[PDB]
Amino acid sequence: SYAFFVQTCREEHKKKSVNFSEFSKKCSERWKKRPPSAFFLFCSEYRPKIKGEHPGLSIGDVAKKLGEMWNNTAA
Amino acid sequence: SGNKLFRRFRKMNARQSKCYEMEDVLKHHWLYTSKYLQKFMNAHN
Amino acid sequence: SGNKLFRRFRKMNARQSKCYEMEDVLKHHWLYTSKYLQKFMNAHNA
Amino acid sequence: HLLSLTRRAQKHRLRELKIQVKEFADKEEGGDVKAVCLTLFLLALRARNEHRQADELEAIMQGRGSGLQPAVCLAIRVNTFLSCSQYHKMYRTVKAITGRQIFQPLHALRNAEKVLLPGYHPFEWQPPLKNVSSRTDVGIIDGLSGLASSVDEYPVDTIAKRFRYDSALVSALMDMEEDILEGMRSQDLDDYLNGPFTVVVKESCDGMGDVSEKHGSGPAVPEKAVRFSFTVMRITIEHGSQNVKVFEEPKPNSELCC
Amino acid sequence: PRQHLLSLTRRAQKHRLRELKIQVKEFADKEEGGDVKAVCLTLFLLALRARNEHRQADELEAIMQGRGSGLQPAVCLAIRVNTFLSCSQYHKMYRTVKAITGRQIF
Amino acid sequence: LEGMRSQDLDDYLNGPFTVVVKESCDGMGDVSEKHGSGPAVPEKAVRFSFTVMRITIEHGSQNVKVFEEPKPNSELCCKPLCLMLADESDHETLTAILSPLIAEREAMKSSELTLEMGGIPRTFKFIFRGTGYDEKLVREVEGLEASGSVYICTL
DNA sequence: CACAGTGATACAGCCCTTAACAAAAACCCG
DNA sequence: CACAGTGATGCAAATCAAGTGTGAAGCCAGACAAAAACCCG
Ligand SMILES: [Ca+2]
Ligand SMILES: [Ca+2]
């Protein structure tokens, strides 16, 4: 119950919200290694392809695409 | 089994002297047989 | 002096099989007489 | 008591003192609360004779893992008469209590062992050895040396294992590289000379007794064991018209060099 | 000629912090009971949490408590006994570890 | 305490704990003598040890066991008590060494032990049972004849 | 002149606390 | 129904690596509730 009235007063005097310092004295009068390999270079080089050609998805789809591309091609 | 442990301790875990070998072996065997120390070795569960 | 080490290695640092103890004891006693390894245990005196 | 409270209540008591500390940090340091507080705590630790914990703290302040090389763990395991089972028990106990690796596991030690065993370093004799192979990767050659073990020949009731002689000498010489280098450096000789060194080796052999036999299958072996060993005693180089002593065993009768 | 706070020895750093040393002592012995190390590690944990770190906080908690990066004497006693280590052997191992690592594990 | 917790009991119980132990004693040979000063010690040894078996509290009407050794024949539970370099056939020295222990055992067989566990005084009672004896030592101690006698059984 | 141990004991060494001075390493000014 | 080893081997499971954008658990300025453990009333 101590927060409901405060939230209502906050909506009240905010409808007329980043200043908490100058709000302190307001409530007083209210309640009263591992060298990489060819595959890691493949990743680091071909992930930005799908990361910049289709940025609308996270790099999970980029990893999925790079993986289905590596599995279909040779090394 | 304790006889085997005694044969081992008298040879490699005691002062080689008649005046103190037996006390050393007895104390070392008492320490070895304790369970409060064996729990620290079962730190797999 | 090495006979002692042989006995102890055979009793405590080898496979207790008739066709495996010889090579185990030999390898262990060879490793035990390596000055390269002995230099590590004396690094405190430096 | 004090400092035994949880959050939002332990600061409630030392709030003023923290304010004073940050005031001084702004006055002299300028805001370096981190260093001054760490140093004050280090001195508070050293005042009560706690060099161990304070050294551990100043070591973890850097943020590096205090680990041991596999060769070091191997040397500790060998030079302290520890079986692989006891070493594994100690390893497991330490890793489970401290929650981190200070020793190396058994496979790392086993892998590092292969560098020291004979048959790992290349070499070649300038005059090829008569009746001796030129392959340089053999390990533990069988002792019988292809002896006939059928029913028609003389009966065989012994077993043996052994290294190859030249590979063993090469491994022994490679195990004493730093010794020879420091000896040459201590004799006013350059450490890049390739003179014809002269190695002197001592040989020994004696049959043991009261050697118990094990059960199980296999041949019926006697209860006696014979061993054969060698020892590099002295190495000298011929510089000019003399024989400079570059190495000498300090303790020849010791078991650490047989 | 001020170089840096850590570029001085313990004695010199004490000479440099004597002011706040005395102040913290005389202001924590009045009402806070009079435990210095307690206030010290509490203030350090507060200033650490200020940086919202958990790694360092847990590290110093384990160090100050005696649970990580360093074994209890009973633990190393159990290790030395249950592995048949001789006192001489154990001292050799302890000396080697302290020399190479530089940190007292046992 | 873990046994007490696992059997659905209360840790603050201070009832009379019933403990039973196992005693053992055997002689040893080929124990070489050392150089130096001292008495003329024989080349033999005799050991004496004890081992707890189980602990049982009387809760309510019946009994319930709290702890019992899982490995009764293990070397990790054979606590040594007395060690002397003597001969198991020397009756005089054997009795001279073992009489204080037997006196202590007899005196303890009729007393209770108040002991603190976790900050609570607990009561202990003991039941001594000696079974780790070979027939030779039983015959030598129980006042019987040798094994080659006509009376063959010790029961 | 075998030599690596083998466990308890003692002592030296090296850290740590009140002391104001006092000698070694460097810029602002002349 | 001795048992804790004694070493190697062989297979199964955990992990790491690089890739990267968001998502989330804190702390913090006062503050005036909400117990709450001391005193006894
Ligand atoms: Ca012989
Ligand atoms: Ca017997």
Side-chain angles (χ1 to χ4, degrees), chain A residues 1-3 5-6 8-9 13 16-21 23-24 26-29 31 33 35-49 52 54-60 63-64 66-75, chain B residues 1-44, chain C, chain D residues 2 4-129 131-258, chain E residues 1-26 28-48 50-106, chain F:
Chain A
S1 66
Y2 183 75
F5 183 74
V6 176
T8 59
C9 293
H13 68 271
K16 66 185 288 184
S17 179
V18 300
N19 190 358
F20 182 76
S21 179
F23 183 72
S24 179
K26 180 67 174 66
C27 294
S28 179
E29 293 83 4
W31 292 97
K33 67 181 178 67
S37 179
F39 182 75
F40 291 165
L41 294 174
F42 182 80
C43 294
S44 66
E45 291 179 353
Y46 292 96
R47 290 180 186 272
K49 299 291 180 68
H54 296 285
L57 294 174
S58 66
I59 65 165
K64 269 156 182 174
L66 216 35
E68 67 183 1
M69 188 67 202
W70 181 256
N71 290 318
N72 290 318
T73 61
Chain B
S1 296
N3 294 119
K4 184 177 179 181
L5 293 175
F6 180 79
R7 292 183 183 272
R8 185 174 179 178
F9 292 163
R10 184 178 181 271
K11 183 174 73 175
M12 292 183 286
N13 296 115
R15 289 188 293 272
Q16 298 298 109
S17 179
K18 291 181 180 179
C19 184
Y20 323 114
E21 63 182 0
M22 300 298 287
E23 182 178 1
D24 292 331
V25 174
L26 183 62
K27 182 174 72 68
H28 183 74
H29 189 191
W30 182 259
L31 292 175
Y32 182 76
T33 310
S34 177
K35 294 181 183 292
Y36 181 76
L37 295 175
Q38 294 178 357
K39 294 181 177 67
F40 293 100
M41 295 300 291
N42 296 115
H44 300 150
Chain C
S1 296
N3 288 319
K4 192 158 133 166
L5 294 174
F6 163 105
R7 292 182 184 272
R8 183 172 177 174
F9 291 164
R10 142 169 224 249
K11 188 182 286 185
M12 294 175 68
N13 290 319
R15 231 129 13 141
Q16 296 299 109
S17 179
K18 187 182 286 185
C19 63
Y20 292 105
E21 62 183 358
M22 291 294 105
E23 65 183 1
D24 291 332
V25 175
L26 183 62
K27 181 174 72 68
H28 183 74
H29 191 273
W30 182 260
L31 293 174
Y32 181 74
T33 62
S34 296
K35 293 183 184 293
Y36 182 76
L37 294 175
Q38 294 178 357
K39 187 179 289 293
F40 273 55
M41 294 299 290
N42 290 318
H44 79 176
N45 192 359
Chain D
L2 75 159
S4 66
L5 282 72
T6 188
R7 242 130 210 153
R8 298 283 75 77
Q10 63 183 357
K11 184 178 183 293
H12 187 273
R13 294 179 66 188
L14 296 174
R15 146 68 84 44
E16 19 264 13
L17 185 59
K18 183 67 180 294
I19 292 168
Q20 184 178 2
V21 172
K22 67 180 73 174
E23 288 178 354
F24 180 74
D26 292 330
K27 181 173 72 68
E28 293 293 329
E29 294 293 328
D32 192 0
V33 177
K34 130 190 249 153
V36 63
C37 290
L38 183 63
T39 304
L40 183 63
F41 183 72
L42 292 174
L43 270 67
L45 200 63
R46 298 293 179 93
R48 292 181 181 178
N49 192 359
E50 292 180 354
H51 295 284
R52 183 180 67 189
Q53 293 180 356
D55 289 345
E56 295 293 327
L57 185 66
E58 68 182 2
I60 63 170
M61 209 202 90
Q62 294 179 357
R64 58 94 174 175
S66 66
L68 292 174
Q69 296 294 322
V72 174
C73 295
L74 181 63
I76 294 169
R77 195 215 110 212
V78 173
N79 203 165
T80 58
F81 291 156
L82 289 173
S83 66
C84 295
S85 179
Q86 298 297 323
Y87 182 77
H88 181 74
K89 289 174 70 176
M90 179 175 68
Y91 153 86
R92 104 251 256 43
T93 300
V94 173
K95 185 177 179 180
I97 294 171
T98 62
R100 62 181 293 165
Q101 293 181 357
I102 297 92
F103 296 96
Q104 296 295 321
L106 293 173
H107 63 86
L109 275 70
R110 200 199 315 306
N111 202 164
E113 290 178 354
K114 292 181 181 179
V115 177
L116 295 173
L117 294 175
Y120 182 75
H121 291 170
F123 63 92
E124 61 90 18
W125 294 90
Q126 183 62 255
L129 294 177
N131 297 115
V132 176
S133 178
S134 66
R135 185 176 176 87
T136 61
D137 63 357
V138 299
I140 298 169
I141 302 299
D142 186 74
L144 280 73
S145 296
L147 183 62
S149 66
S150 178
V151 69
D152 291 331
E153 294 85 1
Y154 202 85
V156 176
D157 59 356
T158 62
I159 61 170
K161 298 292 183 182
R162 62 113 187 185
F163 292 102
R164 225 177 85 199
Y165 216 161
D166 61 357
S167 179
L169 292 176
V170 172
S171 178
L173 293 174
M174 293 299 291
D175 187 74
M176 295 183 287
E177 183 178 1
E178 293 84 3
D179 291 331
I180 298 169
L181 293 174
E182 192 274 331
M184 292 183 286
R185 282 193 303 245
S186 66
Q187 295 294 322
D188 197 1
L189 295 174
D190 56 354
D191 59 357
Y192 64 90
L193 184 62
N194 59 4
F197 293 99
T198 300
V199 176
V200 177
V201 177
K202 167 172 69 156
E203 293 180 353
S204 296
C205 181
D206 185 74
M208 295 177 71
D210 291 330
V211 174
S212 296
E213 185 178 1
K214 293 180 175 66
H215 295 285
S217 66
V221 297
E223 293 180 354
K224 292 181 181 180
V226 176
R227 63 180 293 165
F228 184 76
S229 296
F230 77 79
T231 296
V232 176
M233 294 299 291
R234 185 179 67 189
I235 297 169
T236 60
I237 190 167
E238 184 178 1
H239 187 273
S241 296
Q242 293 82 17
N243 290 318
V244 177
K245 187 184 292 293
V246 299
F247 182 76
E248 184 178 1
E249 181 66 27
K251 293 185 286 185
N253 290 318
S254 178
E255 69 274 16
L256 294 175
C257 64
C258 183
Chain E
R2 296 196 10 133
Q3 293 179 356
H4 192 271
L5 183 63
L6 62 85
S7 231
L8 280 70
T9 187
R10 234 182 302 297
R11 292 348 182 106
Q13 292 179 356
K14 184 185 288 186
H15 181 75
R16 305 276 298 316
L17 328 154
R18 66 185 185 273
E19 29 195 48
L20 266 288
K21 185 178 180 181
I22 297 169
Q23 292 180 358
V24 172
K25 290 182 181 181
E26 68 184 1
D29 62 357
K30 290 180 181 179
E31 191 273 331
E32 343 261 296
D35 191 358
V36 175
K37 184 273 299 292
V39 175
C40 290
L41 87 156
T42 299
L43 293 175
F44 184 78
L45 292 174
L46 293 175
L48 192 152
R51 315 163 256 250
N52 24 315
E53 293 179 353
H54 295 285
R55 166 252 324 261
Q56 255 255 101
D58 292 331
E59 290 180 354
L60 186 145
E61 182 66 27
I63 297 299
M64 253 30 248
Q65 184 62 255
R67 324 141 66 280
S69 225
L71 281 72
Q72 295 296 321
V75 175
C76 64
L77 182 62
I79 295 170
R80 160 192 176 298
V81 172
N82 203 164
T83 59
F84 296 97
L85 288 171
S86 178
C87 183
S88 296
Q89 254 29 299
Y90 181 78
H91 181 74
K92 289 173 69 176
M93 182 179 72
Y94 157 94
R95 118 247 257 43
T96 300
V97 173
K98 184 177 179 181
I100 295 170
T101 301
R103 294 177 66 188
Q104 255 205 353
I105 301 299
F106 309 87
Chain F
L1 293 175
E2 184 178 1
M4 217 171 242
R5 291 189 296 272
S6 179
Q7 296 293 321
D8 292 330
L9 276 73
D10 291 331
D11 290 331
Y12 63 89
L13 293 174
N14 59 5
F17 291 166
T18 300
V19 178
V20 62
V21 299
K22 208 238 283 170
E23 293 179 353
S24 296
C25 181
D26 190 0
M28 294 176 70
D30 291 331
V31 177
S32 66
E33 185 179 1
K34 294 181 176 66
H35 295 284
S37 66
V41 175
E43 278 201 23
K44 292 182 184 293
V46 177
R47 295 180 65 251
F48 183 77
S49 296
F50 83 76
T51 297
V52 298
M53 294 299 291
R54 107 200 19 154
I55 298 169
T56 299
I57 187 169
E58 183 177 1
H59 188 193
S61 178
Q62 65 183 357
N63 291 318
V64 59
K65 63 179 73 175
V66 176
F67 154 102
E68 65 182 1
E69 182 66 27
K71 300 292 181 68
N73 290 318
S74 178
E75 357 123 24
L76 296 175
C77 65
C78 183
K79 293 183 183 293
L81 183 64
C82 182
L83 296 175
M84 86 205 93
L85 295 174
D87 190 359
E88 65 182 1
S89 296
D90 190 359
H91 207 77
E92 293 83 3
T93 301
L94 187 65
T95 58
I97 300 299
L98 293 177
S99 63
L101 294 174
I102 301 300
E104 293 178 353
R105 182 175 180 266
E106 294 293 328
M108 299 181 8
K109 245 183 277 247
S110 65
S111 179
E112 293 179 353
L113 182 62
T114 300
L115 195 281
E116 183 178 2
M117 292 176 69
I120 296 92
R122 302 265 160 79
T123 300
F124 291 96
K125 65 179 72 174
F126 294 98
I127 296 170
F128 297 81
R129 278 178 52 125
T131 61
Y133 293 164
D134 60 355
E135 186 177 2
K136 174 145 161 267
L137 184 63
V138 174
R139 281 181 125 68
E140 185 177 1
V141 173
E142 293 293 328
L144 295 175
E145 294 178 353
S147 296
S149 178
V150 65
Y151 299 82
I152 63 170
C153 183
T154 63
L155 283 73

